Amino acid sequence: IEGRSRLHRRVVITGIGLVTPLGVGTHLVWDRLIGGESGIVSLVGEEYKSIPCSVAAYVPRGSDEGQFNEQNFVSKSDIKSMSSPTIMAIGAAELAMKDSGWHPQSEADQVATGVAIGMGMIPLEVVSETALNFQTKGYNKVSPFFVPKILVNMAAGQVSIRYKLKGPNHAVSTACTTGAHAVGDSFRFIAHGDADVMVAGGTDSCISPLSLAGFSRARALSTNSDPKLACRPFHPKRDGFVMGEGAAVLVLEEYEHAVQRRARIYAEVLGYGLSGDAGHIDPEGEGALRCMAAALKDAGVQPEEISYINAHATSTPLGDAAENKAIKHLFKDHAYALAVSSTKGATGHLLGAAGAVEAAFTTLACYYQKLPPTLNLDCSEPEFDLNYVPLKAQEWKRFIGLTNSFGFGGTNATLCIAGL
Amino acid sequence: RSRLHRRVVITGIGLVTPLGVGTHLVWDRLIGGESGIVSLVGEEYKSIPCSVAAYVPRGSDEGQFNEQNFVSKSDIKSMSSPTIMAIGAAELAMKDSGWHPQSEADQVATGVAIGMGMIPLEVVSETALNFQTKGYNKVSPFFVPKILVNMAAGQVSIRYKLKGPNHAVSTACTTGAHAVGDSFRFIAHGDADVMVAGGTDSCISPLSLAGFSRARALSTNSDPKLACRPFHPKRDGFVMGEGAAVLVLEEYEHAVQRRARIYAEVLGYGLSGDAGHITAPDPEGEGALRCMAAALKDAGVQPEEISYINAHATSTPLGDAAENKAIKHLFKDHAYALAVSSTKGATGHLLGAAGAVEAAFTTLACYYQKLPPTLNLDCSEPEFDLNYVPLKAQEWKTEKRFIGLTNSFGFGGTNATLCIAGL
Ligand SMILES: [N+]
Ligand SMILES: [N+]
């Protein structure tokens, strides 16, 4: 009546695929990130005069190495029935499986491999254009692919079909927290015995006048016209986030499964914490504290064992300060022994993909024992007195990291990830 | 390493459906063989092949949905129709459960997992027009919240002080089952002691119905009395419904200590992907077989112990047959000794809420040991030779444990099954 004990398995990360404003491809992206590079640029197009915002972080497109070329992954015929985020997700999943050396062929390997890829927001423009087409050209001009193009779970569905992944098929949609939940849920499915491998992550492409209008009106997007300075987490002059686009996918695998096939293992997922603010759609950051605490409890590790936090910090006056507070309250005097950085200066806020790209960055920090910098942080206010890895990457017991994702609607998640 | 896997029970249900509002009222009408499927009305729906749907009945009578009972007039303009229905369903579920967290400890011990299959499309297109015409300054600050899938779970959490795990899935027709299954796993794992779990969807509009008709998913039958008929020779697509279902899941000892009324125990949860087609089901039903088997394995139950299956069967030619094939394959000779029914003839297909409403029906089936019928099933092809509880409700008494399955299969080939049992 109190329950039964069951085997709870260890879970590792063996592959990473990245489609980001810093570029495409695992170690290329990590190099640029560590080298202090950024993908934030000025918005181009006449359609953007209607909005106060003038910057964003785009995925670089083209045929050079490190650029995104859709035609490498999908046919011209597929591009009509798939949204841009779905295409980005297929690219990232392909690169992740290649990075892992996992290409399931047998029925047993296919059924043992699932997919958990989330999306924060559906493609607004596709809905917008179809509505107008329906109203002016009639029913029979609506694409038969409209529904399959606009469902949140379609990226996970398409990756499953493309790579014949037949295990659990799951898609979360929790705004900025989306990518973190996808990795955590996958971790849990594997530990529980539902799958031996999970292809997990997040994707989003929300850069459009309407989307940016919506976010400008509902939250704080920076109005800074200088793309080199717009996004500055923890900085006195921070004034809102910068929208990015992209997809990040990780291959999670049961430990003995990985060892048996002699996979290269980046890191171990130790813990997963979740909480709700239950406040507003909190300057003390209580929700953030409870979520980090939950991840520590899940991992069975003490606060003093943590050496690195990849912060959610999106460059907002209230948000960055609340997270800083939650960190200080939880870690107390140990807060001064660890390092904290936000990589959003480099990628922008990738929304649905943010938690996944940052889980990948934390995974690589564990692997390389090196910390990506917080860009643009040349000074700080008294309350910001921690080591935020300002400007330049730093070299760095077991290496244990946390990565935080806090989303619209008060939904919070933290992942605890460690070196092996 | 081994870890404690706690037991999880259902202590409250709140239903907002085309059959009406209020869990036990809806159950009585379902068992009595009622349906909420009606004809569409208005020039707005001209030119679209589908002319039927299932609406939540609105008004101030018993069993009717009155928005004002749950959200204030000013709060309406800040949230979508699905969000409002989820708030209503959640309020009813927590009232049914007798769970209303007050202390910080009870608040942090209680989370929310409510999903949505699809955001109402009309807010996007209307806002787009408003933005193109009146400009930036007239775009609502609530537009983003209205189009985020996770906003139902967020609003329910704020409104009811739920500070535990805050989670939202969006897996089309499988949404509601995932929300319940994920909550089960969170409780069993120790992340929360109580979860407010379910699904909501309210997206019957010209554009949505045009979309699903173009994908060739919907019934083209103009007769609402006959349009939806799972397992029937003349089935020709599903009927879109709307609504919300919320269930209160709770750790077993937690429920016992407070003397909660316990409907049923959640035993198991299984998941799979067809990896076949983005909208069409695997004709072999291999995906369905796999998530049912996975549910039984999670539950520690043998096929021969299952007495009832609440089928996904939405009344499509290929879908219904593929599921029938999966049950026959998995259960073998025992397929003829269990009962299977689809309640979509009564509620329509509630999309994001379907897996949650049908988890609720399966739970009540366990509690009452009575099986809701498949409507409109007056005859069948030779391949449909099982007991589909045709037309009229059946009592299902056993001296052994009543154990049921509920299936949800969605676009994208995403499958889930829940295993729920009497106590
Ligand atoms: N993060
Ligand atoms: N079902």
Side-chain angles (χ1 to χ4, degrees), chain A residues 1-218 220-285 287-420, chain B residues 2-423:
Chain A
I1 172 154
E2 285 82 358
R4 218 108 286 272
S5 75
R6 290 192 191 188
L7 174 58
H8 185 86
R9 306 187 307 174
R10 296 172 66 188
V11 184
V12 296
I13 302 167
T14 61
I16 295 158
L18 299 170
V19 178
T20 69
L22 282 170
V24 173
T26 324
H27 305 292
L28 184 143
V29 176
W30 179 252
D31 282 4
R32 295 181 176 182
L33 175 76
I34 289 294
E37 303 189 39
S38 173
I40 300 165
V41 293
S42 294
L43 286 163
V44 177
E46 302 300 339
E47 63 264 40
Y48 292 109
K49 61 176 168 173
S50 58
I51 66 164
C53 183
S54 56
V55 303
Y58 295 102
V59 168
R61 287 165 185 269
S63 59
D64 303 354
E65 197 98 71
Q67 293 185 324
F68 189 56
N69 178 18
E70 293 186 343
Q71 298 187 310
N72 284 14
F73 307 103
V74 296
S75 68
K76 214 84 192 76
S77 179
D78 295 331
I79 294 162
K80 309 306 157 197
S81 58
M82 295 179 189
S83 68
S84 185
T86 289
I87 299 164
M88 291 187 186
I90 288 162
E94 184 161 309
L95 293 167
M97 294 185 91
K98 166 155 74 66
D99 194 53
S100 179
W102 189 241
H103 313 287
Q105 297 299 332
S106 68
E107 184 266 356
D109 284 347
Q110 292 186 349
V111 304
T113 308
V115 184
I117 294 169
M119 194 182 281
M121 199 169 82
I122 64 158
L124 294 190
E125 305 305 329
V126 183
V127 177
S128 187
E129 286 152 10
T130 304
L132 188 79
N133 212 58
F134 174 53
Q135 293 158 11
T136 61
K137 305 278 173 59
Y139 169 78
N140 300 90
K141 287 293 180 174
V142 176
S143 170
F145 307 122
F146 176 53
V147 169
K149 193 182 260 197
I150 74 174
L151 292 168
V152 155
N153 66 308
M154 293 292 99
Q158 295 282 14
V159 164
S160 172
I161 291 161
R162 179 66 56 87
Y163 302 100
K164 287 287 191 165
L165 315 178
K166 300 184 173 181
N169 190 291
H170 195 258
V172 291
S173 192
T174 45
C176 317
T177 308
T178 294
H181 281 139
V183 172
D185 300 332
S186 292
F187 160 59
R188 292 288 177 80
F189 286 134
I190 294 166
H192 191 84
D194 290 87
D196 288 343
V197 186
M198 288 296 289
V199 177
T203 186
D204 256 334
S205 190
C206 296
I207 311 163
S208 87
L210 188 54
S211 172
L212 292 170
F215 279 97
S216 274
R217 267 271 161 165
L221 282 172
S222 176
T223 55
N224 197 324
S225 60
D226 185 358
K228 294 185 192 187
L229 293 174
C231 186
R232 38 194 173 188
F234 310 119
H235 193 280
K237 294 196 189 191
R238 70 199 187 279
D239 58 12
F241 78 96
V242 172
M243 185 70 66
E245 55 170 10
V249 171
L250 297 73
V251 177
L252 279 64
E253 187 161 2
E254 187 271 328
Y255 178 84
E256 298 293 330
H257 189 277
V259 167
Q260 273 301 305
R261 69 175 188 102
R262 298 184 86 73
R264 176 263 291 107
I265 297 170
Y266 289 119
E268 186 176 3
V269 184
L270 294 186
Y272 176 30
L274 304 86
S275 77
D277 282 0
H280 196 89
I281 51 163
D282 178 28
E284 225 57 50
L289 185 139
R290 287 186 285 105
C291 182
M292 290 187 285
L296 297 179
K297 189 185 178 185
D298 195 33
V301 296
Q302 296 192 262
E304 66 180 44
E305 299 180 69
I306 298 301
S307 40
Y308 173 66
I309 300 168
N310 189 280
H312 180 67
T314 64
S315 196
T316 63
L318 298 171
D320 291 25
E323 186 176 13
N324 184 243
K325 274 199 174 187
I327 293 173
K328 291 181 75 185
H329 296 164
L330 179 53
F331 293 91
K332 312 174 214 74
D333 285 336
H334 185 70
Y336 295 107
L338 50 68
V340 181
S341 72
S342 176
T343 50
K344 287 207 176 58
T347 57
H349 196 349
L350 267 52
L351 303 192
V357 74
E358 290 147 20
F361 289 166
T362 304
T363 295
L364 293 175
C366 290
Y367 187 61
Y368 291 114
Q369 292 184 10
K370 195 163 193 197
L371 315 175
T374 304
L375 295 183
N376 294 326
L377 191 60
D378 58 359
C379 67
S380 51
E381 297 160 90
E383 75 182 287
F384 292 100
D385 60 340
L386 307 188
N387 174 14
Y388 311 100
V389 199
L391 311 175
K392 298 282 190 174
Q394 295 171 12
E395 302 281 316
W396 203 261
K397 313 179 295 161
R398 195 189 186 167
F399 188 108
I400 310 178
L402 301 176
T403 171
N404 289 336
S405 301
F406 311 136
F408 287 75
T411 176
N412 308 309
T414 298
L415 296 164
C416 179
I417 293 164
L420 213 43
Chain B
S2 59
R3 217 174 163 277
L4 177 65
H5 197 259
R6 308 187 304 174
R7 297 173 69 172
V8 185
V9 295
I10 296 167
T11 57
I13 299 159
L15 302 182
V16 171
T17 78
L19 283 180
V21 176
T23 297
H24 299 273
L25 176 60
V26 171
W27 175 256
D28 288 337
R29 298 175 168 178
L30 178 74
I31 287 291
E34 297 194 23
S35 183
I37 292 165
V38 300
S39 289
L40 292 178
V41 281
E43 304 288 302
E44 47 196 298
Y45 292 104
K46 287 185 92 75
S47 88
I48 301 163
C50 183
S51 52
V52 292
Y55 295 100
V56 180
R58 286 167 187 269
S60 39
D61 291 344
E62 70 141 313
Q64 296 184 325
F65 190 59
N66 185 342
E67 288 192 342
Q68 315 284 42
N69 291 159
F70 307 102
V71 301
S72 73
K73 279 205 287 175
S74 73
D75 286 345
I76 290 167
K77 48 173 265 184
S78 79
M79 54 190 60
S80 70
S81 179
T83 296
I84 301 165
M85 290 182 180
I87 297 172
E91 177 154 311
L92 293 180
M94 298 190 86
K95 190 173 126 299
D96 191 40
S97 185
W99 187 245
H100 306 284
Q102 288 277 306
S103 68
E104 173 76 359
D106 284 349
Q107 284 181 57
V108 305
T110 312
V112 188
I114 299 172
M116 286 191 64
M118 194 175 87
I119 56 152
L121 305 169
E122 270 64 23
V123 294
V124 172
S125 52
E126 288 159 12
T127 303
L129 183 70
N130 187 23
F131 175 57
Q132 287 287 76
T133 299
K134 294 185 196 288
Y136 172 74
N137 280 127
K138 302 306 166 189
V139 176
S140 177
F142 304 116
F143 167 60
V144 166
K146 281 186 180 198
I147 63 166
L148 291 180
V149 157
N150 67 306
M151 288 299 107
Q155 284 295 340
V156 166
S157 165
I158 293 158
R159 168 75 172 280
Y160 302 107
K161 306 173 194 174
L162 316 169
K163 298 186 169 187
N166 193 106
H167 197 255
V169 294
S170 190
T171 45
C173 317
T174 311
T175 298
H178 282 141
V180 176
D182 292 339
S183 298
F184 158 61
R185 293 288 182 82
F186 285 132
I187 298 165
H189 189 84
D191 303 299
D193 287 344
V194 184
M195 290 295 292
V196 177
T200 186
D201 251 329
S202 188
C203 65
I204 302 167
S205 71
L207 187 56
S208 182
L209 293 177
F212 278 99
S213 290
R214 278 305 254 168
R216 311 202 56 93
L218 302 172
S219 172
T220 50
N221 195 333
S222 55
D223 181 359
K225 298 174 88 178
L226 295 179
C228 184
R229 42 192 164 184
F231 313 116
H232 188 273
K234 305 187 164 200
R235 69 196 186 274
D236 66 348
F238 74 85
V239 179
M240 195 184 286
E242 55 168 16
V246 167
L247 298 79
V248 175
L249 272 59
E250 187 165 351
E251 193 270 328
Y252 204 163
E253 190 63 21
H254 193 273
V256 168
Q257 289 297 300
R258 76 184 182 93
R259 291 168 288 268
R261 179 253 275 107
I262 300 172
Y263 288 113
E265 186 179 359
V266 182
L267 298 186
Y269 177 32
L271 301 85
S272 70
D274 283 1
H277 195 273
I278 209 73
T279 61
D282 172 17
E284 261 31 85
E286 271 180 284
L289 180 151
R290 286 188 272 108
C291 68
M292 288 187 288
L296 296 178
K297 185 183 179 186
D298 193 32
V301 166
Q302 301 301 315
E304 287 73 26
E305 301 180 70
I306 299 301
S307 27
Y308 173 65
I309 299 167
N310 189 279
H312 178 65
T314 67
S315 197
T316 67
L318 304 166
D320 293 20
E323 174 166 28
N324 187 62
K325 278 165 174 155
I327 291 158
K328 274 161 73 70
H329 193 151
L330 175 56
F331 294 93
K332 298 175 182 190
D333 281 351
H334 182 76
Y336 297 87
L338 50 69
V340 179
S341 73
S342 174
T343 46
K344 289 208 176 54
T347 58
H349 188 352
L350 300 207
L351 314 168
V357 77
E358 286 147 27
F361 293 161
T362 301
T363 295
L364 293 170
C366 286
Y367 185 67
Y368 288 114
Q369 295 209 20
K370 192 158 184 193
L371 312 184
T374 311
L375 300 182
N376 291 334
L377 196 53
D378 55 354
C379 69
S380 64
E381 305 147 63
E383 81 188 284
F384 300 98
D385 59 343
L386 312 178
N387 177 15
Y388 308 102
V389 200
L391 310 167
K392 256 75 184 297
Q394 292 177 11
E395 272 132 62
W396 207 259
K397 310 304 170 188
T398 38
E399 289 301 318
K400 293 183 176 83
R401 200 177 189 181
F402 193 101
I403 310 176
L405 295 186
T406 178
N407 293 336
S408 294
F409 315 137
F411 300 83
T414 176
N415 308 308
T417 295
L418 298 164
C419 180
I420 299 161
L423 270 167

